[PDB]
Design an enzyme around this catalytic site. Structure first.
Site, PDB file in Angstrom:
ATOM      1  N   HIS A 226      -4.536  -5.777  -4.006  1.00  0.00           N
ATOM      2  CA  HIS A 226      -5.253  -6.423  -2.900  1.00  0.00           C
ATOM      3  C   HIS A 226      -6.689  -5.955  -2.934  1.00  0.00           C
ATOM      4  O   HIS A 226      -7.080  -5.237  -3.846  1.00  0.00           O
ATOM      5  CB  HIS A 226      -4.571  -6.297  -1.541  1.00  0.00           C
TER       6      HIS A 226
ATOM      7  N   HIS B  77      -8.769  -4.095  -0.985  1.00  0.00           N
ATOM      8  CA  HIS B  77      -9.340  -2.889  -0.424  1.00  0.00           C
ATOM      9  C   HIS B  77      -9.761  -1.904  -1.519  1.00  0.00           C
ATOM     10  O   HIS B  77      -9.333  -1.971  -2.685  1.00  0.00           O
ATOM     11  CB  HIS B  77      -8.356  -2.256   0.551  1.00  0.00           C
TER      12      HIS B  77
ATOM     13  N   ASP C 126      -9.003   1.171  -2.166  1.00  0.00           N
ATOM     14  CA  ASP C 126      -7.956   1.921  -2.841  1.00  0.00           C
ATOM     15  C   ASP C 126      -7.273   1.119  -3.957  1.00  0.00           C
ATOM     16  O   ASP C 126      -6.446   1.694  -4.680  1.00  0.00           O
ATOM     17  CB  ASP C 126      -6.943   2.515  -1.853  1.00  0.00           C
TER      18      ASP C 126
ATOM     19  N   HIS D 292       0.458  -6.155   4.719  1.00  0.00           N
ATOM     20  CA  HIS D 292      -0.655  -5.246   4.905  1.00  0.00           C
ATOM     21  C   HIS D 292      -1.984  -5.987   4.833  1.00  0.00           C
ATOM     22  O   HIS D 292      -2.946  -5.619   5.514  1.00  0.00           O
ATOM     23  CB  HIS D 292      -0.549  -4.168   3.841  1.00  0.00           C
TER      24      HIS D 292
ATOM     25  N   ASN E 255      -3.149   1.664   7.726  1.00  0.00           N
ATOM     26  CA  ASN E 255      -4.379   0.980   8.099  1.00  0.00           C
ATOM     27  C   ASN E 255      -4.078  -0.507   8.233  1.00  0.00           C
ATOM     28  O   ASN E 255      -3.906  -1.211   7.238  1.00  0.00           O
ATOM     29  CB  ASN E 255      -5.486   1.237   7.090  1.00  0.00           C
TER      30      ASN E 255
HETATM   31  C1  LIG Z   1      -9.065   1.795   1.889  1.00  0.00           C
HETATM   32  C2  LIG Z   1      -8.044   1.370   2.933  1.00  0.00           C
HETATM   33  C3  LIG Z   1      -7.571   2.582   3.736  1.00  0.00           C
HETATM   34  C4  LIG Z   1      -8.420   3.573   4.206  1.00  0.00           C
HETATM   35  C5  LIG Z   1      -7.911   4.679   4.908  1.00  0.00           C
HETATM   36  C6  LIG Z   1      -6.549   4.808   5.149  1.00  0.00           C
HETATM   37  C7  LIG Z   1      -5.672   3.819   4.666  1.00  0.00           C
HETATM   38  C8  LIG Z   1      -4.281   3.620   4.715  1.00  0.00           C
HETATM   39  C9  LIG Z   1      -3.229   4.517   5.323  1.00  0.00           C
HETATM   40  C10 LIG Z   1      -3.394   5.123   6.546  1.00  0.00           C
HETATM   41  C11 LIG Z   1      -2.399   5.941   7.046  1.00  0.00           C
HETATM   42  C12 LIG Z   1      -1.239   6.148   6.324  1.00  0.00           C
HETATM   43  C13 LIG Z   1      -0.142   7.068   6.881  1.00  0.00           C
HETATM   44  S1  LIG Z   1       1.018   6.146   7.945  1.00  0.00           S
HETATM   45  C14 LIG Z   1       1.863   4.949   6.878  1.00  0.00           C
HETATM   46  O1  LIG Z   1       2.017   7.018   8.540  1.00  0.00           O
HETATM   47  O2  LIG Z   1       0.227   5.471   8.987  1.00  0.00           O
HETATM   48  C15 LIG Z   1      -1.083   5.554   5.086  1.00  0.00           C
HETATM   49  F1  LIG Z   1       0.046   5.737   4.326  1.00  0.00           F
HETATM   50  C16 LIG Z   1      -2.076   4.746   4.577  1.00  0.00           C
HETATM   51  C17 LIG Z   1      -4.059   2.443   4.028  1.00  0.00           C
HETATM   52  C18 LIG Z   1      -2.791   1.674   3.874  1.00  0.00           C
HETATM   53  O3  LIG Z   1      -2.047   1.638   4.906  1.00  0.00           O
HETATM   54  O4  LIG Z   1      -2.633   0.892   2.880  1.00  0.00           O
HETATM   55  N1  LIG Z   1      -5.187   1.943   3.627  1.00  0.00           N
HETATM   56  C19 LIG Z   1      -6.196   2.729   3.987  1.00  0.00           C
HETATM   57  N2  LIG Z   1      -8.569   0.353   3.843  1.00  0.00           N
HETATM   58  C20 LIG Z   1      -9.881   0.156   4.370  1.00  0.00           C
HETATM   59  C21 LIG Z   1      -9.795  -1.226   4.979  1.00  0.00           C
HETATM   60  C22 LIG Z   1     -10.539  -1.377   6.287  1.00  0.00           C
HETATM   61  C23 LIG Z   1     -12.037  -1.568   6.079  1.00  0.00           C
HETATM   62  C24 LIG Z   1     -12.741  -2.135   7.320  1.00  0.00           C
HETATM   63  N3  LIG Z   1     -14.122  -1.698   7.391  1.00  0.00           N
HETATM   64  O5  LIG Z   1      -8.369  -1.456   5.224  1.00  0.00           O
HETATM   65  C25 LIG Z   1      -7.660  -0.547   4.447  1.00  0.00           C
HETATM   66  O6  LIG Z   1      -6.463  -0.534   4.300  1.00  0.00           O
HETATM   67 ZN   LIG Z   2      -3.500   0.996   1.046  1.00  0.00          ZN
HETATM   68 ZN   LIG Z   3      -5.293  -1.942   1.979  1.00  0.00          ZN
END
Ligand SMILES: C[C@@H](c1cccc2c(-c3ccc(CS(C)(=O)=O)c(F)c3)c(C(=O)O)[nH]c12)N1C[C@H](CCCN)OC1=O
Ligand SMILES: [Zn+2]
Ligand SMILES: [Zn+2]
Length: 232
Positions: free
Chosen positions: A85, A87, A89, A150, A181
């Site tokens: 996707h 993002h 990561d 997601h 997120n």
């Molecule tokens: C780069 C990415 C992003 C950044 C930081 C964290 C995550 C998390 C994440 C969070 C918490 C948990 C633990 S838990 C399941 O217990 O909650 C987890 F496992 C993953 C995810 C995801 O969940 O895949 N991804 C993140 N980004 C940025 C983008 C938004 C940009 C808007 N300016 O959206 C996105 O996903």
């Molecule tokens: Zn992610």
């Molecule tokens: Zn993501």
């Protein structure tokens, strides 16, 4: 020393690989985002005497470190990469890959969203994935579009030789307490998309989330559960 490497165990900028099955590894790196540190996974699949990469290591320097770790531990060239996707990561590091000879791919939906967001953009479009339930072959994997979860563009990856299901960020690890997120998620559609994955890949033996520890098929139901409760 053998267990799955965890967020506190990987300094930001280093990459570790984990053998999942014959010819299948995950890659694990850590990154800072909005003042917190997170782990994230990708996949490596042997493709004869080449390697197929799924997802970057979340950033340019992490992705350079990934390529170095692959050369140290495996020693076969990464020739193609798929980002699951839009993002950072998943695509952050695509420019590094493209400068290291790797052909980078994503769906047209991912490419459009990455471009609109200011993220790095894979070079090549993957057609045939625009409708939920669509599947296409890409080297030694099958790519599957389950529907919005997601993100609206999230793809999953199956390795049929090993029955490995790489869920990407549409699938969460068993210890998760919320849906991660959710900025770009569709919480209402996500359980339906997970049900599609469950129906399509009933023989999966290992399920790998986008972040955190692999396990078995229970990760899919757990994901539906944490998402439904997040929406509520
Ligand atoms: C780069 C990415 C992003 C950044 C930081 C964290 C995550 C998390 C994440 C969070 C918490 C948990 C633990 S838990 C399941 O217990 O909650 C987890 F496992 C993953 C995810 C995801 O969940 O895949 N991804 C993140 N980004 C940025 C983008 C938004 C940009 C808007 N300016 O959206 C996105 O996903
Ligand atoms: Zn992610
Ligand atoms: Zn993501």
């Amino acid at each position: 020393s053998g267990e799955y490497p965890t967020v506190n165990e990987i300094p930001v900028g280093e990459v570790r690989l984990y053998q999942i099955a014959d010819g299948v590894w995950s890659h694990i790196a850590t990154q800072s985002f909005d003042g917190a540190v997170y782990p994230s996974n990708g996949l490596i699949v042997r493709d004869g005497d080449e390697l197929l990469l799924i997802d970057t290591a979340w950033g340019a320097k992490n992705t350079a470190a990934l390529l170095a770790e692959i050369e140290k531990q495996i020693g076969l060239p990464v020739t193609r990469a798929v980002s699951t996707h839009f993002h950072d990561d998943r695509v952050g590091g695509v420019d590094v890959l493209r400068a290291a000879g790797v052909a980078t791919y994503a769906s047209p939906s991912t490419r459009r969203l990455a471009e609109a967001e200011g993220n790095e953009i894979p070079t090549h479009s993957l057609e045939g994935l625009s409708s939920s339930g669509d599947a296409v072959r890409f080297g030694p994997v099958e790519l599957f579009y389950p529907g919005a979860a997601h993100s609206t563009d999230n793809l999953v990856v199956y390795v049929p030789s090993a029955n490995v299901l790489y869920g990407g960020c549409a699938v969460h690890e068993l210890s998760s307490t919320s849906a991660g997120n959710v900025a770009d998620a569709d919480l209402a559609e996500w359980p339906t998309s997970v049900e599609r994955i469950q129906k399509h890949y009933p023989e999966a033996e290992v399920v790998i989330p986008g972040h955190g520890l692999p396990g078995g098929l229970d990760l899919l139901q757990h994901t539906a559960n944490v998402v439904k409760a997040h929406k509520n």
